[PDB]
Design a binder for this molecule. Structure first.
Ligand code: MG
Ligand code: MG
Ligand code: MG
Ligand code: MG
Ligand code: MG
Ligand code: MG
Ligand code: MG
Ligand code: MG
Ligand code: MG
Ligand code: MG
Ligand code: MG
Ligand code: MG
Ligand code: MG
Ligand code: MG
Ligand code: MG
Ligand code: MG
Ligand code: MG
Ligand code: MG
Ligand code: MG
Ligand code: MG
Ligand code: MG
Ligand code: MG
Ligand code: ZN
Ligand code: ZN
Lengths: 25, 130, 129, 102, 81, 64, 225
RNA sequence: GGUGAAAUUCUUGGAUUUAUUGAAGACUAACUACUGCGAAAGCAUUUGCCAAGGACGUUUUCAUUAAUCAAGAACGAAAGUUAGGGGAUCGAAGAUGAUCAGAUACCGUCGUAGUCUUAACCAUAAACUAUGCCGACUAGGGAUCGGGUGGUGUUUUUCUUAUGACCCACUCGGCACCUUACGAGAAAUCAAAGUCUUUGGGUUCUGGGGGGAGUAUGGUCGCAAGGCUGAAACUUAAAGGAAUUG
RNA sequence: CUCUAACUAUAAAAAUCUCUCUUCUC
């Protein structure tokens, strides 16, 4: 693994969860 | 691919060192010599030693060289390095009697408090690139 | 002058398909546009010296037919953004022009060079062949 | 580990340097770590200097030369034989390799 | 090194070294008495003078501004005082 | 056309080619002896031989 | 070398049979007045050859136009204006350096000084002049380099600017070329800037035309004869 | 055209290469260096204006006004985001023809958003000298840049006194370099990473095995991307540094 | 103890891999 891409995956998860929260409100 | 290995080289070199007065430039004569005067078990090794010794004979007669230093060459160097010329070539005599110096060396001589006949001259201190 | 008919060879030598394109002193009227690819079959040895040599020989024949004897060569590379470096064919074309009867004079390096213009092709890490 | 004291860059006090593009591989690279060779060359080789000479008016021409300053990358330079991987104790010798033609 | 008289160094050492480094620091500058070519009025001038020191008698410059010691008027006469 | 040319090698320039069988040779033409050219030749060669060329314009470089 | 897609989105004629030759004569200031020959299509009214010729440019080394080899590195552009018949008259267009000398004298360990200026000449010609200078090792150097301080470049650059301003605004392009042939202006610059720094090998680069008044037929007639 | 090769794509409506030009936008080669400046990011055409700054010089002035910095603040590469001005090259996403078993990757031809700007944000980079700042000292040698000193120095000629540019010698300050250990460390190596078990000059900030993870949540700033602050449950006996030999 | 000159030019494709790791005092 290369920490760049792990951070990219984590930020993708962050974006997905933030969009879910925005749709929830 | 024949390179005349260490043993033959050292044996022939020692033969040179100890026997050069009694050696010639002819392969057959040195072959008979080295067979009679140095115990060699095998004929092939004897012949190789004789060949290398003859090659070194031709080399030495061509001129004294590295490594080989026997009695005659050492005596020649002894009588040749004891060479002493005539008057010392400094002697205040050669190169326009009363030799040239520089002003700073002149004042060294003056500060020493000795005579040391002198001839002052500047330097034109320009530093050439060269 | 010795009653000579001057011309300009002005070779353009990229790393592929060396060009030989002679014109008059005014530079506008073209003679013998035949190039390296004209005289080779592979379409990939165009940069090879053979293509340039045959092109130069045919140019020389055309020049002898039209009267231009002495030449003023202007060697050019692609230059500009691309590598600033002369191609291999153009020099052989120049030599072939030299052999075949014609005369030379004032060979020039007319490589177009920029003063850092043109953010150019390749990307950050560049070619990755 | 510290491979080279000068970091193999030769910047050491500039912060940032303007990038330059490689001649062959077109890689952007800091201009100091952009190994550079002054390709100063005669416009034709000796195999054609004669050929041009007898086919030349203006006898004894100056035969003008072509100059260029190749700014390689490092990958092309090591691949295209310009720079050679030398031994550890020989890295610290920065003089050109002993008078190419003597 | 390793054995010195820092208290009695050679005068050459005093001269060569930068000031503020001597045992006691004394400014390398000095004061000079200078005669203007026009009027005989003598004037006292600091070696590294800053402003153009015209004589009070007449508008004749005696020193010119410079990073180091001021440059004179090429005709006036200076003596170290 | 029969522009066959003859050239005597004066120096053997080692041996070139990945195969290790082709020789670079510096041949001076028998006609116009003042001119010399280097060319590639396949087969055994020694200096002093005289060799045949269909083309004499082509300069031969190393065969990679 | 055979065929191609030929995405068209015999009737051949000879190129040279319908073509004809013309001669070029240089301004009388130049030494070797005969320049060479140029190829034209055959003269047919309604687009006569005269319309095509006037405006062309001929690109010739200065050593050719003088005879000696000391002018090898220079290279003059001439503009085709008047057609006499079997011979055409050309006015001065521009003058330049060959790239080889320029690249040769731009070496390391000596910074260059460039001086650009845009000046009207004596009569009406708007021109642009470049000046290239290089620092010189004094013949006692032990420091291996001859960099100049930006103040020195400022002074030398300005001085060259007024030097060119005077030498162009005072005399016309013909007299300008008269000064240009024996490069008196170069040694003038070297002398005028000698007190700043040695400044090896100053030269005038890319004498570039910008604008011309109307035609001045009489000027051309006086130029050639 | 382009390449290891191959087409993709433009071509007698004459493509490509020619000569003049013109257009817009971009950058500022070659000089360009173990070289300059700045707090850092960074900064390279000319000229004017605007203020600013270090170093040097200073027998000028105040006399502790200082250093580091929690809280607070200003700058802060690229990429990103708003709108408006641009619109050339180049080019993420896409469109294409090759490579391969497959290739929406590497080679190649178009190509939006972006690169360029004006206001508004964002504040992160391998922002690296992976070395915090201010101090003092310790070892020799060269050069380099800025400044100032002496040269009865040389080139310069405006007869010549003045400049300038060099040569020498000295000094102050900066990027650095070479030899070396007599010190240091684990070693690479360092003239600072020394003056440290002979442990003490003043100071801020960081870390306590590795994964979990710079993740969950709570704040906090931002329109947005996300930035700062920031654990545990659990799991593991190693992960890691340096050099040595294959 | 006076010395500042010569140069060339390649990047086709190439993926994967099972046990079994242990012993130095006289
Ligand atoms: Mg590779
Ligand atoms: Mg490594
Ligand atoms: Mg390097
Ligand atoms: Mg066309
Ligand atoms: Mg500078
Ligand atoms: Mg700085
Ligand atoms: Mg520049
Ligand atoms: Mg804080
Ligand atoms: Mg941006
Ligand atoms: Mg926009
Ligand atoms: Mg594909
Ligand atoms: Mg793609
Ligand atoms: Mg691959
Ligand atoms: Mg691509
Ligand atoms: Mg494109
Ligand atoms: Mg950070
Ligand atoms: Mg850090
Ligand atoms: Mg820091
Ligand atoms: Mg932990
Ligand atoms: Mg983690
Ligand atoms: Mg948050
Ligand atoms: Mg390791
Ligand atoms: Zn490269
Ligand atoms: Zn007075």
């Amino acid at each position: 693994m290369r920490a760049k891409w792990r951070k990219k995956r984590t930020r993708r998860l962050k974006r997905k969860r933030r969009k879910v929260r925005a749709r929830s409100k | 691919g024949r390179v005349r290995t260490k043993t033959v080289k050292r044996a022939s070199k020692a033969l040179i060192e100890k026997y050069y007065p009694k050696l010639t430039m002819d392969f057959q004569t040195n072959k008979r010599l080295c067979d009679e005067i140095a115990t060699i078990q095998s004929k092939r090794l004897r012949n190789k030693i004789a060949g290398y010794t003859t090659h070194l004979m031709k080399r030495i007669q061509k001129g004294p060289v590295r490594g080989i230093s026997f009695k005659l060459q050492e005596e020649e160097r002894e009588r040749k390095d004891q060479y002493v010329p005539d008057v010392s070539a400094l002697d205040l005599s050669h190169s326009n009697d009363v030799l040239n110096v520089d002003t700073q060396t002149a004042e060294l001589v003056n500060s020493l408090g000795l005579k040391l006949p002198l001839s002052v001259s500047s330097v034109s201190a320009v530093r050439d690139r060269r | 002058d010795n009653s000579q008919v001057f011309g300009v060879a002005r070779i353009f030598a990229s790393f592929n398909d060396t060009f030989v394109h002679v014109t008059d002193l005014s530079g506008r009227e073209t003679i013998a546009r035949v190039t390296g690819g004209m005289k080779v079959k592979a379409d990939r040895d165009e940069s090879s010296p053979y293509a340039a040599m045959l092109a130069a020989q045919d140019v020389a024949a055309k020049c002898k037919e039209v009267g231009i004897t002495a030449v003023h060569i202007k060697i050019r590379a692609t230059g500009g953004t691309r590598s600033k470096t002369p191609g291999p064919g153009g020099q052989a074309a120049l030599r072939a022009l030299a052999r075949s009867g014609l005369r030379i004079g004032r060979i020039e390096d007319v490589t177009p060079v920029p003063s850092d213009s043109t953010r150019k092709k390749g990307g950050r890490r560049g070619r990755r062949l | 580990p510290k491979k080279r004291a000068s970091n193999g860059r030769n910047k050491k006090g500039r912060g940032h340097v303007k990038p330059v593009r490689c001649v062959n591989c077109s890689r952007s690279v800091p201009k100091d770590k952009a190994i550079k060779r002054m390709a100063i060359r005669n416009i034709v080789e000796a195999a054609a200097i004669r050929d041009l000479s007898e086919a030349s008016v203006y006898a004894e021409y100056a035969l003008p030369k072509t100059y260029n300053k190749l700014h390689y990358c490092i990958s092309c330079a090591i691949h295209a034989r310009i720079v050679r991987v030398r031994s550890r104790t020989d890295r610290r010798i920065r003089a050109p390799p002993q008078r190419p033609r003597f | 090194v390793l054995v010195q008289d820092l208290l009695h160094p050679t005068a050459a050492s005093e001269a060569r070294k930068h000031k503020l480094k001597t045992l006691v620091q004394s400014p390398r500058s000095h004061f000079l008495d200078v005669k203007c070519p026009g009027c005989l009025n003598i004037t006292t001038v600091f070696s590294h003078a800053q402003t153009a020191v015209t004589c009070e008698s007449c508008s004749t410059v005696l020193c010119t501004p410079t990073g180091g010691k001021a440059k004179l008027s090429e005709g006036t006469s200076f003596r170290r005082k | 056309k029969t522009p066959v040319t003859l050239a005597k090698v004066i120096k053997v320039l080692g041996r070139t080619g990945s195969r290790g069988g082709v020789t670079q040779v510096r041949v001076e033409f028998l006609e116009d002896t003042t001119r010399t050219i280097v060319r590639n030749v396949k087969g055994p060669v020694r200096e002093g031989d005289i060799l045949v060329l269909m083309e004499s314009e082509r300069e031969a470089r190393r065969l990679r | 070398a055979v065929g191609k897609n030929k995405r068209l989105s015999k009737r051949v004629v000879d190129p040279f049979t319908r073509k004809e030759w013309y001669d070029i004569k240089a301004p009388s200031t130049f030494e070797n007045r005969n320049v060479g020959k140029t190829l034209v299509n055959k003269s047919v009214g309604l687009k006569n050859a005269s319309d095509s010729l006037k405006g062309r440019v001929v690109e010739v080394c200065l050593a050719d136009l003088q005879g000696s080899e000391d002018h090898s590195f220079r290279k003059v552009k001439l503009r085709v204006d008047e057609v006499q018949g079997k011979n055409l008259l050309t006015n001065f267009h521009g003058m330049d350096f060959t790239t080889d000398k320029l690249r040769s004298m731009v070496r390391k360990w000596q910074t260059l000084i460039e001086a650009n200026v845009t000046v009207k000449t004596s009569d009406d010609y708007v021109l642009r002049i470049f000046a290239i200078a290089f620092t010189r090792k004094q013949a006692n150097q032990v420091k291996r380099t001859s960099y100049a301080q930006s103040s020195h470049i400022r002074q030398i650059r300005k001085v060259i600017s007024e030097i060119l301003t005077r030498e162009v605004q005072n005399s016309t392009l013909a007299q300008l070329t008269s000064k240009l042939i024996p490069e008196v202006i170069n040694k003038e610059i070297e002398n005028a800037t000698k007190d700043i720094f040695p400044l090896q090998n100053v030269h005038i680069r890319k004498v570039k035309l910008l604008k011309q008044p109307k035609f001045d037929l009489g000027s051309l007639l006086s130029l050639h004869g």
